[PDB]
């Protein structure tokens, strides 16, 4: 088509697709930061008794230990599926890609560059 319509389309389209990812993500990171401020909630202080205070230090401490363990598990499995991304990706990609590197032509040098090297100063508005 005489489709400047299509050009501004597709910029806007990859825009809106990353934007649906982004609304996906606004929901996600809301939950993220929300759970952040809560999962350890800025705590309350005035007038308390010392035994309870050391109990709470120890408590939040073991909570570090435990939350560490737990997010670490989410990591380990994320990592397993990450290796899986590596491997499904890489290995299906073996079934499924690998000349995605095209005929990598360096005659696709900076083409404007070799152009200019052969033309001179006639290239000013672009």
């Amino acid at each position: 088509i005489s489709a400047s319509r299509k050009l501004q389309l597709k910029t806007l389209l990859l825009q809106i697709a990353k934007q649906e990812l982004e609304r996906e993500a606004e929901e996600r990171r809301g939950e993220k930061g929300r759970a952040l401020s809560t999962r350890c909630q800025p705590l309350e202080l005035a007038g308390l008794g010392f035994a309870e205070l050391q109990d709470l230090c120890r408590q939040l401490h073991a909570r570090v230990d435990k939350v560490d363990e737990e997010r670490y598990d989410i990591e380990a499995k994320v990592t397993k599926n990450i290796t899986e991304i590596a491997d499904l990706t890489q290995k299906i990609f073996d079934l499924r890609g690998k000349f995605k590197r095209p005929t990598l032509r360096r005659v696709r040098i900076s083409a404007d560059a070799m152009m200019q090297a052969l033309l001179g100063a006639r290239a000013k508005e672009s």
Binding site: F99, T103, L104, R105, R106, V107, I109, S110, A113
Partner: protein, 375 residues
């Protein structure tokens, strides 16, 4: 000429050096592994002239030069001459040099290790390369060919390596190296052309017979039937133009030269030929490997440009091979250039960026480092 520090690639044989930069699918120029020297006493002055000539200079002024080749059967015996050829290759004609670029070299798996040690020292100390890697020619042929598996006949100028590779791994126990290559085929041709009344002895003559072979010769699928006619009729003869306007007419010699690949006994070699040699590289591998190597006979290097080679090889292997099994041959247009091309592919692969020896590791270990870091 270039706007990036891309690796440079050089395929250095006893014939010519193919060279260019990584990322291309061809060398930028070819540099004959030749240093020429005058064999005559000068009389005139103010004539320019060189003390020694290299590459294409050596061939262009060859009328009064003796032309020597620094590499024998894949080994550099004269590396001072290779440094002059390389200086020209890099700084005058390709317009790139190891000084500002990492460099990949191509080699056979059983190439004497001392030869890599010396080339490694030269590129790091004479050309100041920031990094190096010496790659297997069979690997390079498989990348260029779109394969991870096959028997690669790398057909060099002075030696043919013949190494089976399966799933990207070497199967070294089945390497059938043969001391037969394009330069030996030339020797057979000049001896039979000598019998016809055209001796080729001196340098100009040596270059002509090599050129005759490259343009007139072929193998054909059936030698004996080709000869029954070629030995009986002038219709199979071709006249080649010699530099002085004279011609040489060649008959069955046109195929008898190439035939040495199938008949090494023609030059005094105790061998059954390249198809038997290929067969053994397949047949000595485990039976669950054999099927993939029979399906992947890979021709590379030079001499594979001879008409009929794909058919001659596939038919001979099929005859040697077990029945039922399908024997297939790969003989792409990227012939003779596929080793260089594979060098470009390998040098540029993202999976290979950590495989380079840096000029840190090199000086700490010295040139022998190539024996631990490359292969």
């Amino acid at each position: 000429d270039e706007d990036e520090t891309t690796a440079l690639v050089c395929d250095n044989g006893s014939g010519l050096v193919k060279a260019g930069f990584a990322g291309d699918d061809a060398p930028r120029a070819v540099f004959p592994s030749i240093v020429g020297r005058p064999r005559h006493q000068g009389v005139m002055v103010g004539m320019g002239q060189k003390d020694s000539y290299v590459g294409d200079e050596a061939q262009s002024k060859r009328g009064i030069l003796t032309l020597k080749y620094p590499i024998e059967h894949g080994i550099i015996t004269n590396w001072d001459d290779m440094e002059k050829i390389w200086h020209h290759t890099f700084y005058n004609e390709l317009r790139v040099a190891p000084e500002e670029h990492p460099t990949l070299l191509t080699e056979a798996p059983l190439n004497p290790k001392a030869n890599r040690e010396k080339m490694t020292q030269i590129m790091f100390e004479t050309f100041n390369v920031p990094a190096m890697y010496v790659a297997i020619q069979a690997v390079l042929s498989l990348y260029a060919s779109g394969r991870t598996t096959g028997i690669v006949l790398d057909s060099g100028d002075g030696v043919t390596h013949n190494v089976p590779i399966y799933e990207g791994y070497a199967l070294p126990h089945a390497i059938m190296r043969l001391d037969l290559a394009g330069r030996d085929l030339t020797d057979y041709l000049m001896k039979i052309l000598t019998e016809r009344g055209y001796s080729f002895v001196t340098t100009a003559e040596r270059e002509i017979v090599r050129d005759i072979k490259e343009k007139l010769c072929y193998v054909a699928l059936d030698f004996e039937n080709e000869m029954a006619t070629a030995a009986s009729s002038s219709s199979l003869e071709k006249s080649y133009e010699l530099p002085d306007g004279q011609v040489i007419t060649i008959g069955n010699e046109r195929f008898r030269c190439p035939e040495t690949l199938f008949q090494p006994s023609f030059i005094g070699m105790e061998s059954a030929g390249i198809h038997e040699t290929t067969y053994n590289s397949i047949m000595k591998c485990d039976i669950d490997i054999r099927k993939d190597l029979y399906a992947n006979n890979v021709m590379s290097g030079g001499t594979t440009m001879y008409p009929g080679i794909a058919d001659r090889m596939q038919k001979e292997i099929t005859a040697l091979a077990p029945s039922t099994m399908k024997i297939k041959i790969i003989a792409p247009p990227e012939r003779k250039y596929s080793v260089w091309i594979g060098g470009s592919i390998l040098a540029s692969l993202s999976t290979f960026q950590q495989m380079w020896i840096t000029k840190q590791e090199y000086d700490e270990a010295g040139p022998s480092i190539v024996h631990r870091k490359c292969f």
